[model samples]
Target: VNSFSGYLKLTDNVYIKNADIVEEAKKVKPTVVVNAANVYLKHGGGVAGALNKATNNAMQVESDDYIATNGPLKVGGSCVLSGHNLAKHCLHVVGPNVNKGEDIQLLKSAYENFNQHEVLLAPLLSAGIFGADPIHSLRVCVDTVRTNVYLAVFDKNLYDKLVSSFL
Candidate 1:
């Protein structure tokens, strides 16, 4: 169980077994968790799945302040948006096939919402199941959602200059 406070840094492709994950997250008390993946809606689970799981069961089982709703997007589609009535906010962004740029835009919108409300919970991204290269997808997502005040997560070694593009 390794843990550190204040900006934990990890290298690319580091093999973290289940034991390591249990140890690290337990010690750090992470405010947000991010998962990045490229896949269909079923595999992606949209925003609702991401938030419910990322909060480490704290959002639903531990608190009654959590709320999630299917909201209409300007693009004439529905996206899952979840937030804490009392503490944190979760935004789920779904990317269409081929044109992942749309997903990037959606992530940007979510970040903007977080900024507008001035909420401080960590932002989470979905990962692993999507067909595209996990690291590349994460770079794109992180680039779109970068913020000085918010915590962001990405697959190992996935965050690089590509992430700076959206910054």
Candidate 2:
């Protein structure tokens, strides 16, 4: 089963976890969960899709409505959506796409936007389809949020990669 395998402390309030965000969110029960989203806020795959699936796809519906009302989110932008069957809220963050010539600053801004929430659950924003270097993207997360946050990483290889780097 997907689970919390282990973690390494990044700071007094931040941690890197070898766990499933969907599963760990239920146990850690953070006040808010973050969706690493596209500018259109589509919960198509990766962490976004997983969270949407766990929440009965409510996120996608909300995201669609959000886009309809507020227009598409710009890169490094964010908005809050109502969570279902888990946390009360979901922070939808749009990170920079390296393949599209965006820089780390945009990604940093995405993580920076998460600072308002204390107990937050997140995945490595920009590290998946957005094509960011995993380690650097993780560093951006560490440098930004710096709160009671858990970064859930599901891949064993990535878990070991983070372990070797952090622990």
Candidate 3:
């Protein structure tokens, strides 16, 4: 499972999981949507190494606006890192790796939570995989999330090929 953290204020953007994408957007009124995937642990450091630096760039998009994977939603367990304070109040839901029935249930629950909240920020998608093709992995994320997805790739040629399928 992936774990990280960032700063967030009650008024800041709200990040949601793929399952809650549409419903959360409708209820939370987010400015953008991000689709995140693959999450893991670091050996020596905490979220400081994994999240702080990356969030530095993500914050550029909008101060205090970012999203990330908390962990496997169906599992309902804590990650191995620290400083995941941002995920505390944010929405958490299942993804593609989860059972289909569980995914739907999580989405519905997320919608209910959003109805109780205000505006949502964007959803964040993860990159990399334990052992899977980037394209297939991303597709699983996109299909499960079911919305406009943002993907990051280190391989330009591969990214282009993946984008072509959607185009």
Candidate 4:
């Protein structure tokens, strides 16, 4: 009762620009990152799509390999690749198509997409680029995973806000 992982065992790293996600990925060079996408492995637009393009469609090629095998990687599933463009590795996670509706299960499943790395750069999953409230993804991710997590952002103040609200 007196010991624990100290809240989320997480870190808050703000990159400072929404438009620079792809560029910064190349510069900061994160070892691990989570891409928000569907089980079909679509780049899913926004930062994720940019990341895919930045890597010269490496993710698309990887996903296409899965499709050929009749793989239904479904929500909560992830596909890992070797440092495609910026990251030393990339884990593409299947998330809910929020435009379809808010399914707590799918959003919750999204957290399971993490590749169990010590450090991981995950977007405000199911939010922003993915289009859901930031708080919801944070709340569910906290409940869904048992490993350290990272939530990247462009605004430092909001990162603090999230730390207060989520951690």
Candidate 5:
């Protein structure tokens, strides 16, 4: 079973962890959830896609509306204003690893704009499909964002050391 490795400053003990993000969310219930989105706000795959269905498509709508006004999400671009419709769905989501940029900056931007987050739930920004290295993503996110995060993942396969560092 996967366990927690010390990360973040405030709550360094077992902070970066391994578990079902959604189910774990039910218990821990973080105030903010940094979603890796596309510039257009489409949750096609991964945890984001599942979140889309969970929010009754409201998550998609939030991202959609954001794009409708400001424009596509930038790599380092940020908007902590995205929210769910109801209190139960009051979890805050941010678009950092969205469309447009595939470089490390995309994920970096999300943490860069960590505007209004208290107990942030962090997913390894992008380990695949975005050409980002899993280890690098983890390192960058933890290194860039100082907040103690509950690193959400489906399993132990967080990232690969073979190529993550290269990218």
Candidate 6:
């Protein structure tokens, strides 16, 4: 139940924290919550699954509607949709697949795909089942974000690693 258990200010407008994205979205009320989405934009596992449950599967319906209209999201592309009981919008981004030889630039592009927003809550993209290295993915996020962003991390070890890397 604890949110933002540890925090670090990487810049005046950017931050990193040990927290849950769903909880942080509800508590911090960012303008958008970035979902590390699959190319299909399906709310299956990882951040997408948690978001799906949090919004009572409304988010999945939204995803379905989006895909039905626009087709599957391309890697390094993103789309915004209505958020419920959390941030005002959910920015679903498709990160690069490491096994498929999609490189860091594509992953970096995914992180940079958001429009201008006041506060953006994001998780470490591509680092879960997608097979992106933790430190490398975190570095990509840290380097690419431009808006007021709070990087919500669920892993305590990664939190410690980031704290050590930056602070």
- Evaluated against the true structure, the overall lDDT of model 3 is 0.30
Model 4 TM-score, 2 decimals: 0.73
Residue-pair clashes per prediction, in order, are 7, 0, 15, 1, 4, 0
lDDT tens per residue, model 1, 1-167: 22333342222211121122222333444333221222222322433345445555554442232222322233212223333332222333333333344443344444343333322223233233323343444444345433333333433344343234322
TM-score of each: 0.36, 0.89, 0.32, 0.73, 0.70, 0.89
Which candidate should be chosen as best, given TM-score against the real structure?
2
lDDT of 2 by residue, 1-167 (tens): 22334667778777787778888877755678888888898888888888889878887888888889999988999888886766778888888878778876888889888888867878888887778888888877777776667788888798789768863
Q: For model 2, which pairs clash?
A: none
CA lDDT of 104 in candidate 2?
68
lDDT of 5 by residue, 45-159 (tens): 7776766666688777777776788887665554564435321333323334424354555566665555344456666666545446566666666567654456665555552
Task: Candidate 6: list runs displaced more than 4 Å.
Answer: 1-6, 99-101
lDDT of 2 at 134: 86
Q: Which prediction has more favorable TM-score, 3 or 4?
A: 4
After superposing all C-alphas onto the true structure, candidate 3 shows an RMSD in angstroms of 12.8
> What is candidate 6's local distance difference test score?
0.80
Candidate 1 regions exceeding 4 Å error are 1-5, 8-50, 54-107, 123-148, 160-167
Winner by lDDT? 2
- Residue 51 C-alpha lDDT in model 1: 45
Model with the higher TM-score, candidate 4 or 6: 6
lDDT of each: 0.34, 0.80, 0.30, 0.65, 0.55, 0.80
lDDT of 5 at 71: 84
RMSD (Å) of each candidate, 1 decimal: 8.4, 3.3, 12.8, 5.9, 5.5, 3.1
lDDT score, candidate 6, position 53 = 93
lDDT of 2 at 63: 81
lDDT of 3 by residue, 1-167 (tens): 12212222111132122232333333433333222222222211221233334334332222123223342233211121221223223233222223222232233323232233333233322223222344554444443433332222435565556556532
